[PDB]
Amino acid sequence: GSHMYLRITNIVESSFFTKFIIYLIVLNGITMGLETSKTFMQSFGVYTTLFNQIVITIFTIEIILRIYVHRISFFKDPWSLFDFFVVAISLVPTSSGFEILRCLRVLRLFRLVTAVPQMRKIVSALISVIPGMLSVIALMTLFFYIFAIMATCLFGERFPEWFGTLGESFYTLFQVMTLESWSMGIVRPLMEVYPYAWVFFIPFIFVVTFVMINLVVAIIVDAMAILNQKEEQHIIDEVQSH
Amino acid sequence: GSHMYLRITNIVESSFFTKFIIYLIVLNGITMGLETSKTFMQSFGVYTTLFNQIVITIFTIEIILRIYVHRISFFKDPWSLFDFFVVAISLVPTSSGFEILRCLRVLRLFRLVTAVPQMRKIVSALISVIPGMLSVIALMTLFFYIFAIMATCLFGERFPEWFGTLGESFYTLFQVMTLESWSMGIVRPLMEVYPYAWVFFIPFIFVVTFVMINLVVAIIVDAMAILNQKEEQHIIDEVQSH
Amino acid sequence: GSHMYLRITNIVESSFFTKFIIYLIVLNGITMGLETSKTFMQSFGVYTTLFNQIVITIFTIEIILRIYVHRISFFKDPWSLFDFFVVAISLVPTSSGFEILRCLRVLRLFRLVTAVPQMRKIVSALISVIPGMLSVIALMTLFFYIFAIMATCLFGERFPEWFGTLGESFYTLFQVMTLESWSMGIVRPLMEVYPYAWVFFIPFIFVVTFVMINLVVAIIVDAMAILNQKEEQHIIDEVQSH
Amino acid sequence: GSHMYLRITNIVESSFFTKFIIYLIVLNGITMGLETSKTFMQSFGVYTTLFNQIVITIFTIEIILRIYVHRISFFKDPWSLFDFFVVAISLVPTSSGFEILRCLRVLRLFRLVTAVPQMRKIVSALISVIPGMLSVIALMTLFFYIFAIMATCLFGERFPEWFGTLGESFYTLFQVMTLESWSMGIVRPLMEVYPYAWVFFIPFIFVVTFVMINLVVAIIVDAMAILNQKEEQHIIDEVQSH
Ligand SMILES: CCCCCCCCCCCCCC(=O)OC[C@H](COP(=O)(O)OCC[N+](C)(C)C)OC(=O)CCCCCCCCCCCCC
Ligand SMILES: CCCCCCCCCCCCCC(=O)OC[C@H](COP(=O)(O)OCC[N+](C)(C)C)OC(=O)CCCCCCCCCCCCC
Ligand SMILES: CCCCCCCCCCCCCC(=O)OC[C@H](COP(=O)(O)OCC[N+](C)(C)C)OC(=O)CCCCCCCCCCCCC
Ligand SMILES: CCCCCCCCCCCCCC(=O)OC[C@H](COP(=O)(O)OCC[N+](C)(C)C)OC(=O)CCCCCCCCCCCCC
């Protein structure tokens, strides 16, 4: 039994195997770039379509193998779960009146992140910030929800494209947060009917802007506070212990 | 006497009471989201209106109770003052030719910030920066006031929508500070009549931008200077005292 | 002789004198805000005009006095030089076919910065950064000059409003640096004639953006490097000297 | 032999030589600014054209000399390589149906950066950050490539100006990253046909924005972590060694 199992485990945990997979990702990447062109597709079109159907069958083996080799531990791995879903997507057939999935196929190129350790590290690094930010995101989202409800009620009847709905207002308030056209595009028009509308949007811009800056400052200053704690230990320990 | 008073104080300072209040906030939140839809309002409309009239009577008890339990100390509490005003708003009746207040009702969902300690902390944290910034805000506001007066006098007669008034110019100068359409929307048009107008707006953009960046840098560098002072004490004390 | 001189020096260096001056600044401030309105000017117009002619004569005494009291040292003072020029401006009479100066009158409200120590400190603080930035500004300005010359030569004949002139191109390149309408407003139009124009503007946006961010980072990291040097001294001196 | 070689090496490594070169750069700079004007070119036009043909012959000597003096070491020098190419450009004759190069002539003013040590230092300083950023740029570029392919496939048939091509989509996605017109100009139009398009662009804006901020924070916090390591050594060494 454990004779057969290790036969595959030595294959899977192989460096070659990894490298081979990575080789395909890059190739199926270059492939999917060229499929973008209907010129290319009119000549070398069909070659590409089978290469796609190959790579995807190969990748399905890969995952089955990875699962057999890792069993439970695989579904406990964020990176493997990703690889499952991003290949699973590529399995569900175009046929069934949902041409959208034919467009998501290309998420399988994210496997290159999943398969290359220095990419993995970066992603892990970026993500590591988020869980501290969760409450602040929640507060900001509540803030949006309140203001979105208020604007729907104040401006939605005269300005329904922008505020007719909680979603329209959620969308407009995000545009205002990015400051895209907020004045020329949105508020200057609102004021033609609601002259005091600036009393809603300037303070919204102040709060939302102030928060994002403070978040950044908090992150930097709080992180530098830890590095200073860590110094105190090692500087004070070599003063005490010596 | 102090028999009856403590009967309520044990209720109010109850965890259950807090949790119950919080439960309503979330529900009256979800409620006010659905009121946004006239579809929903045409079916389940009236259920919602009474739930609103209940929650608001309940919340008025809550505050009366909170006041009896806390007396003076309550009106010395920013968080309670908020809760008073944000519920008071919700009391003043729609009737009296001011439909605006019907739209402010929803500020009562900010109680969720007021009622949940980790939200409270964040808000306290964000606000803690402001009092150091006060003079700089004052300087910036003076700067706006001077430039707003100057632009009203230079451009207001040909460009009254944007500069006819001190307020129009205050509003335009804030749009320029955010850089929304400043060139295409405002300055490029001004130059068609006042070719040297760029001499007003580029330097305004330099000053205002430079200041906001410097403020951020000052905050970070000045905060890291304190954390280094605090280290000196503990590092130097364990060198001296030992 | 030095009997008479000190008679005035005790007046000038008076706290009252300072406070009186500051009192006028605020009042002549509020005044110049109300002059903004032709409604107000049609009623209380003339009161205002004489108050202006008073304040300005008073301020001219002030400066003469300040000069007599300080002699050479006055013209060596940036803050006094400012006060000289910002009041001098207000002296040159509207008459002489230059209505622009009537609009600069209001720069005299900057005296409030000049006259209030906590404002003075802020301004001094903001300015303290600039001299380190001088070379980098020079580099950036050279960069603009080169790119402005290149764009005038590439795009100015088809796009003269935006690039016909070194100044037009200098102005457009600053708009691109702020990212105002850079694509929709400028580059997307250029591409209709010069399809590879993106090869000029994306890299311009990368360089200019990268530099401004790096400048900020350099300032923060370099400033935190000094505060760490200063610690080393005091931490190492109390280790050696004790 | 080494008699003749040193005759030139003393010339080239001369301070005067450097200063002379720098003098021309500034002059040929001022020159190329004035060539921008067809007024000036109609009067003093030809003077300028020969001055240009002189400066460029002189600069070609300079480089030949620099090469003879430095041999191999020259082509190992980024700054000299630059000087070679930026002067080489200026050699290839306008004639050959490529009027574009007549516009690149002016890159030779970048020699002033190359020739002035404090400029050199800045450029070296800015560049010093990039190699750490390489992987993150690669990740971001992969991200753009995936999203550009997806948008070409989702929106390119109805919105070909913006998404018809991988390049059009690459270009649009960069405009969205800068947030120029992203909503009013791009997404609001897309939604008229593809109402859920916001599900593509908001998350694209979140990822891309989050990353750029994190990069800046990482740089600052990671750099301050090194300066704290360096302190530990010198603070702990003067505790141990003394
Ligand atoms: C800290 C947590 C904060 C979380 C906040 C995130 C919530 C985001 C919800 C986004 C709303 C999604 C729906 C949307 O945008 O569309 C508006 C709809 C449509 O109105 P309706 O007129 O029904 O349109 C249907 C089409 N018709 C008329 C032709 C049949 O109108 C509606 O159906 C309104 C939907 C309201 C549902 C509210 C759910 C969120 C509960 C969060 C509670 C916060 C606690 C205080
Ligand atoms: C460090 C502190 C700095 C603080 C600065 C903040 C001041 C912000 C004031 C905002 C101005 C609010 C009024 C506004 O924007 O509207 C412009 C008005 C209206 O002109 P008007 O033609 O009267 O319009 C009335 C309508 N009508 C003609 C049909 C009867 O025209 C006016 O009435 C002008 C109002 C001028 C009042 C000035 C009050 C601020 C005093 C601050 C003193 C600073 C010390 C140097
Ligand atoms: C590190 C230092 C960098 C400093 C760079 C800052 C220089 C900024 C200069 C701004 C240019 C100001 C003039 C401007 O923008 O207008 C363009 C003019 C007008 O052309 P034109 O056709 O003569 O128009 C006159 C009107 N007309 C035809 C009806 C008689 O066309 C011209 O006259 C062009 C003016 C060129 C003068 C150049 C002066 C700057 C020398 C900096 C040297 C850098 C060293 C490499
Ligand atoms: C971490 C590394 C990431 C690096 C990503 C950077 C790649 C950027 C490539 C930019 C694409 C340049 C071409 C472009 O934008 O134009 C689109 C073309 C033109 O379509 P087409 O219809 O042939 O137009 C020709 C004109 N016609 C029809 C009249 C004869 O359509 C095409 O030809 C599409 C070109 C696809 C080539 C893909 C090359 C990049 C391979 C990167 C592999 C990533 C590994 C996962």
JSON list of N, CA and C in Angstrom, two decimals, chain A residues 171-206:
[
{"chain": "A", "resi": 171, "resn": "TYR", "atom": "N", "xyz": [-22.38, 53.10, -4.63]},
{"chain": "A", "resi": 171, "resn": "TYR", "atom": "CA", "xyz": [-21.48, 53.23, -5.81]},
{"chain": "A", "resi": 171, "resn": "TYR", "atom": "C", "xyz": [-21.03, 54.70, -5.95]},
{"chain": "A", "resi": 172, "resn": "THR", "atom": "N", "xyz": [-21.97, 55.63, -5.89]},
{"chain": "A", "resi": 172, "resn": "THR", "atom": "CA", "xyz": [-21.64, 57.07, -6.01]},
{"chain": "A", "resi": 172, "resn": "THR", "atom": "C", "xyz": [-20.71, 57.47, -4.86]},
{"chain": "A", "resi": 173, "resn": "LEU", "atom": "N", "xyz": [-20.97, 56.99, -3.65]},
{"chain": "A", "resi": 173, "resn": "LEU", "atom": "CA", "xyz": [-20.20, 57.41, -2.45]},
{"chain": "A", "resi": 173, "resn": "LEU", "atom": "C", "xyz": [-18.77, 56.91, -2.57]},
{"chain": "A", "resi": 174, "resn": "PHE", "atom": "N", "xyz": [-18.59, 55.74, -3.17]},
{"chain": "A", "resi": 174, "resn": "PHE", "atom": "CA", "xyz": [-17.23, 55.21, -3.45]},
{"chain": "A", "resi": 174, "resn": "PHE", "atom": "C", "xyz": [-16.54, 56.09, -4.51]},
{"chain": "A", "resi": 175, "resn": "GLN", "atom": "N", "xyz": [-17.27, 56.53, -5.53]},
{"chain": "A", "resi": 175, "resn": "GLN", "atom": "CA", "xyz": [-16.70, 57.44, -6.55]},
{"chain": "A", "resi": 175, "resn": "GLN", "atom": "C", "xyz": [-16.26, 58.73, -5.84]},
{"chain": "A", "resi": 176, "resn": "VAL", "atom": "N", "xyz": [-17.09, 59.26, -4.95]},
{"chain": "A", "resi": 176, "resn": "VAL", "atom": "CA", "xyz": [-16.77, 60.50, -4.19]},
{"chain": "A", "resi": 176, "resn": "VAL", "atom": "C", "xyz": [-15.52, 60.24, -3.33]},
{"chain": "A", "resi": 177, "resn": "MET", "atom": "N", "xyz": [-15.41, 59.06, -2.70]},
{"chain": "A", "resi": 177, "resn": "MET", "atom": "CA", "xyz": [-14.25, 58.71, -1.84]},
{"chain": "A", "resi": 177, "resn": "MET", "atom": "C", "xyz": [-12.96, 58.74, -2.66]},
{"chain": "A", "resi": 178, "resn": "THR", "atom": "N", "xyz": [-12.97, 58.21, -3.89]},
{"chain": "A", "resi": 178, "resn": "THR", "atom": "CA", "xyz": [-11.83, 58.24, -4.85]},
{"chain": "A", "resi": 178, "resn": "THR", "atom": "C", "xyz": [-11.64, 59.67, -5.38]},
{"chain": "A", "resi": 179, "resn": "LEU", "atom": "N", "xyz": [-12.64, 60.54, -5.16]},
{"chain": "A", "resi": 179, "resn": "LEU", "atom": "CA", "xyz": [-12.69, 61.96, -5.61]},
{"chain": "A", "resi": 179, "resn": "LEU", "atom": "C", "xyz": [-12.85, 62.05, -7.14]},
{"chain": "A", "resi": 180, "resn": "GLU", "atom": "N", "xyz": [-13.23, 60.97, -7.82]},
{"chain": "A", "resi": 180, "resn": "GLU", "atom": "CA", "xyz": [-13.43, 61.03, -9.29]},
{"chain": "A", "resi": 180, "resn": "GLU", "atom": "C", "xyz": [-14.68, 61.88, -9.60]},
{"chain": "A", "resi": 181, "resn": "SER", "atom": "N", "xyz": [-14.49, 63.04, -10.22]},
{"chain": "A", "resi": 181, "resn": "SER", "atom": "CA", "xyz": [-15.58, 63.91, -10.72]},
{"chain": "A", "resi": 181, "resn": "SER", "atom": "C", "xyz": [-16.49, 64.36, -9.58]},
{"chain": "A", "resi": 182, "resn": "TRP", "atom": "N", "xyz": [-16.10, 64.16, -8.34]},
{"chain": "A", "resi": 182, "resn": "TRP", "atom": "CA", "xyz": [-17.04, 64.35, -7.22]},
{"chain": "A", "resi": 182, "resn": "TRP", "atom": "C", "xyz": [-17.78, 65.70, -7.35]},
{"chain": "A", "resi": 183, "resn": "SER", "atom": "N", "xyz": [-17.08, 66.78, -7.75]},
{"chain": "A", "resi": 183, "resn": "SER", "atom": "CA", "xyz": [-17.65, 68.16, -7.76]},
{"chain": "A", "resi": 183, "resn": "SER", "atom": "C", "xyz": [-18.32, 68.45, -9.12]},
{"chain": "A", "resi": 184, "resn": "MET", "atom": "N", "xyz": [-17.55, 68.61, -10.17]},
{"chain": "A", "resi": 184, "resn": "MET", "atom": "CA", "xyz": [-18.05, 68.79, -11.56]},
{"chain": "A", "resi": 184, "resn": "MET", "atom": "C", "xyz": [-19.11, 67.74, -11.92]},
{"chain": "A", "resi": 185, "resn": "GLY", "atom": "N", "xyz": [-18.89, 66.49, -11.58]},
{"chain": "A", "resi": 185, "resn": "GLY", "atom": "CA", "xyz": [-19.71, 65.38, -12.07]},
{"chain": "A", "resi": 185, "resn": "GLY", "atom": "C", "xyz": [-20.94, 65.15, -11.23]},
{"chain": "A", "resi": 186, "resn": "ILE", "atom": "N", "xyz": [-20.87, 65.40, -9.92]},
{"chain": "A", "resi": 186, "resn": "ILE", "atom": "CA", "xyz": [-21.91, 64.95, -8.95]},
{"chain": "A", "resi": 186, "resn": "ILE", "atom": "C", "xyz": [-22.44, 66.13, -8.14]},
{"chain": "A", "resi": 187, "resn": "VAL", "atom": "N", "xyz": [-21.60, 66.76, -7.32]},
{"chain": "A", "resi": 187, "resn": "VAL", "atom": "CA", "xyz": [-22.10, 67.72, -6.30]},
{"chain": "A", "resi": 187, "resn": "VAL", "atom": "C", "xyz": [-22.57, 69.01, -6.98]},
{"chain": "A", "resi": 188, "resn": "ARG", "atom": "N", "xyz": [-21.83, 69.52, -7.95]},
{"chain": "A", "resi": 188, "resn": "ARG", "atom": "CA", "xyz": [-22.18, 70.80, -8.62]},
{"chain": "A", "resi": 188, "resn": "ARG", "atom": "C", "xyz": [-23.57, 70.65, -9.25]},
{"chain": "A", "resi": 189, "resn": "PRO", "atom": "N", "xyz": [-23.86, 69.55, -9.98]},
{"chain": "A", "resi": 189, "resn": "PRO", "atom": "CA", "xyz": [-25.22, 69.22, -10.40]},
{"chain": "A", "resi": 189, "resn": "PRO", "atom": "C", "xyz": [-26.28, 69.11, -9.29]},
{"chain": "A", "resi": 190, "resn": "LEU", "atom": "N", "xyz": [-25.95, 68.47, -8.16]},
{"chain": "A", "resi": 190, "resn": "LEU", "atom": "CA", "xyz": [-26.89, 68.30, -7.02]},
{"chain": "A", "resi": 190, "resn": "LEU", "atom": "C", "xyz": [-27.25, 69.68, -6.49]},
{"chain": "A", "resi": 191, "resn": "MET", "atom": "N", "xyz": [-26.31, 70.61, -6.52]},
{"chain": "A", "resi": 191, "resn": "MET", "atom": "CA", "xyz": [-26.47, 71.92, -5.85]},
{"chain": "A", "resi": 191, "resn": "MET", "atom": "C", "xyz": [-27.46, 72.75, -6.66]},
{"chain": "A", "resi": 192, "resn": "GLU", "atom": "N", "xyz": [-27.66, 72.39, -7.93]},
{"chain": "A", "resi": 192, "resn": "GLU", "atom": "CA", "xyz": [-28.54, 73.19, -8.81]},
{"chain": "A", "resi": 192, "resn": "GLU", "atom": "C", "xyz": [-29.96, 73.09, -8.25]},
{"chain": "A", "resi": 193, "resn": "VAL", "atom": "N", "xyz": [-30.24, 72.03, -7.52]},
{"chain": "A", "resi": 193, "resn": "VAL", "atom": "CA", "xyz": [-31.54, 71.70, -6.88]},
{"chain": "A", "resi": 193, "resn": "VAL", "atom": "C", "xyz": [-31.41, 71.77, -5.36]},
{"chain": "A", "resi": 194, "resn": "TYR", "atom": "N", "xyz": [-30.31, 71.28, -4.78]},
{"chain": "A", "resi": 194, "resn": "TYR", "atom": "CA", "xyz": [-30.07, 71.17, -3.31]},
{"chain": "A", "resi": 194, "resn": "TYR", "atom": "C", "xyz": [-28.81, 71.95, -2.98]},
{"chain": "A", "resi": 195, "resn": "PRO", "atom": "N", "xyz": [-28.95, 73.28, -2.82]},
{"chain": "A", "resi": 195, "resn": "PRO", "atom": "CA", "xyz": [-27.79, 74.16, -2.66]},
{"chain": "A", "resi": 195, "resn": "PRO", "atom": "C", "xyz": [-26.88, 73.83, -1.47]},
{"chain": "A", "resi": 196, "resn": "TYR", "atom": "N", "xyz": [-27.40, 73.17, -0.45]},
{"chain": "A", "resi": 196, "resn": "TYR", "atom": "CA", "xyz": [-26.65, 72.88, 0.80]},
{"chain": "A", "resi": 196, "resn": "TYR", "atom": "C", "xyz": [-26.07, 71.48, 0.73]},
{"chain": "A", "resi": 197, "resn": "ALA", "atom": "N", "xyz": [-26.29, 70.75, -0.36]},
{"chain": "A", "resi": 197, "resn": "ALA", "atom": "CA", "xyz": [-25.71, 69.41, -0.61]},
{"chain": "A", "resi": 197, "resn": "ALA", "atom": "C", "xyz": [-24.22, 69.37, -0.25]},
{"chain": "A", "resi": 198, "resn": "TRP", "atom": "N", "xyz": [-23.49, 70.48, -0.38]},
{"chain": "A", "resi": 198, "resn": "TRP", "atom": "CA", "xyz": [-22.05, 70.50, -0.05]},
{"chain": "A", "resi": 198, "resn": "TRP", "atom": "C", "xyz": [-21.86, 70.13, 1.43]},
{"chain": "A", "resi": 199, "resn": "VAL", "atom": "N", "xyz": [-22.89, 70.35, 2.24]},
{"chain": "A", "resi": 199, "resn": "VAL", "atom": "CA", "xyz": [-22.85, 70.08, 3.70]},
{"chain": "A", "resi": 199, "resn": "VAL", "atom": "C", "xyz": [-22.81, 68.57, 3.92]},
{"chain": "A", "resi": 200, "resn": "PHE", "atom": "N", "xyz": [-23.31, 67.77, 2.99]},
{"chain": "A", "resi": 200, "resn": "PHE", "atom": "CA", "xyz": [-23.23, 66.28, 3.03]},
{"chain": "A", "resi": 200, "resn": "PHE", "atom": "C", "xyz": [-21.87, 65.77, 2.54]},
{"chain": "A", "resi": 201, "resn": "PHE", "atom": "N", "xyz": [-21.34, 66.31, 1.44]},
{"chain": "A", "resi": 201, "resn": "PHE", "atom": "CA", "xyz": [-20.27, 65.65, 0.64]},
{"chain": "A", "resi": 201, "resn": "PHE", "atom": "C", "xyz": [-18.88, 66.10, 1.12]},
{"chain": "A", "resi": 202, "resn": "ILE", "atom": "N", "xyz": [-18.68, 67.38, 1.45]},
{"chain": "A", "resi": 202, "resn": "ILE", "atom": "CA", "xyz": [-17.36, 67.87, 1.97]},
{"chain": "A", "resi": 202, "resn": "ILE", "atom": "C", "xyz": [-17.03, 67.09, 3.24]},
{"chain": "A", "resi": 203, "resn": "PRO", "atom": "N", "xyz": [-17.95, 67.01, 4.24]},
{"chain": "A", "resi": 203, "resn": "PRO", "atom": "CA", "xyz": [-17.66, 66.32, 5.49]},
{"chain": "A", "resi": 203, "resn": "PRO", "atom": "C", "xyz": [-17.46, 64.82, 5.25]},
{"chain": "A", "resi": 204, "resn": "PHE", "atom": "N", "xyz": [-18.25, 64.22, 4.35]},
{"chain": "A", "resi": 204, "resn": "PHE", "atom": "CA", "xyz": [-18.04, 62.82, 3.91]},
{"chain": "A", "resi": 204, "resn": "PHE", "atom": "C", "xyz": [-16.60, 62.68, 3.38]},
{"chain": "A", "resi": 205, "resn": "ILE", "atom": "N", "xyz": [-16.16, 63.61, 2.53]},
{"chain": "A", "resi": 205, "resn": "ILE", "atom": "CA", "xyz": [-14.78, 63.58, 1.97]},
{"chain": "A", "resi": 205, "resn": "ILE", "atom": "C", "xyz": [-13.77, 63.76, 3.10]},
{"chain": "A", "resi": 206, "resn": "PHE", "atom": "N", "xyz": [-14.03, 64.65, 4.06]},
{"chain": "A", "resi": 206, "resn": "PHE", "atom": "CA", "xyz": [-13.09, 64.86, 5.19]},
{"chain": "A", "resi": 206, "resn": "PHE", "atom": "C", "xyz": [-12.98, 63.55, 5.98]}
]
